[PDB]
Amino acid sequence: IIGGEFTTIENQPWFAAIYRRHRGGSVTYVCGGSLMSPCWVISATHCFIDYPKKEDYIVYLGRSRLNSNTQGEMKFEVENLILHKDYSADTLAHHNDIALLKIRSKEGRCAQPSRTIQTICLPSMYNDPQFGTSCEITGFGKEASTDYLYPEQLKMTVVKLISHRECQQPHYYGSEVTTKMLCAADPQWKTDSCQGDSGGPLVCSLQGRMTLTGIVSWGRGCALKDKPGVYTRVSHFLPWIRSHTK
């Protein structure tokens, strides 16, 4: 997150941190995710695509810092890794950029609710907030596009949903942005999501609930003028989610 505030997981209790193990001893951060129900976390397919070996990823819930522990955190193994069939990336966009991870702890249980672990709500079929709505994004991604490390403390920030008409303007992303995507930016192009925030949530209030409206997917640079962040439009993938989360 470029700009934003530093926060704690009690402020985003559905945020999931996904890491990968390496033979050698290190564990490196990969992407964020969100908890939809006790056993499923949703993230982005582009985060796993190059290394789809589920046994090598670890998922932690209730985590406020990146490499140090938070009290109350839960560690899980990835029981199932469902990537989207039809996922495609081009010179910028990622299409159908959503993935599901079924988690299991070493004792065989799924997540348990606490003051730091809560689920986030799914929108109703093709139901979205109107553009102009302010939504928040959270994550452990870069703070400046030139950094080569990720922050240790969790960050958050607020961005506004913009319309497709605005996003598809030639000098923004043209037709690279489709109907299964949403664009969100900061009026002053000051704060935004960046690498590492990928897979994480875009939360807006819909019909009174905090709903998972988007998943951080792609964008040109970070906090660049006329280059919004593009999110997978969750409301349009509900059938796909259902298919696997029944």
Binding site: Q12, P113, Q118, T119, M210
Partner: peptide, 10 residues
């Protein structure tokens, strides 16, 4: 207690 999606508790 139990899960209530979208609810934070502070």
């Amino acid at each position: 207690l139990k899960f209530q999606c979208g609810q934070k508790t502070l």
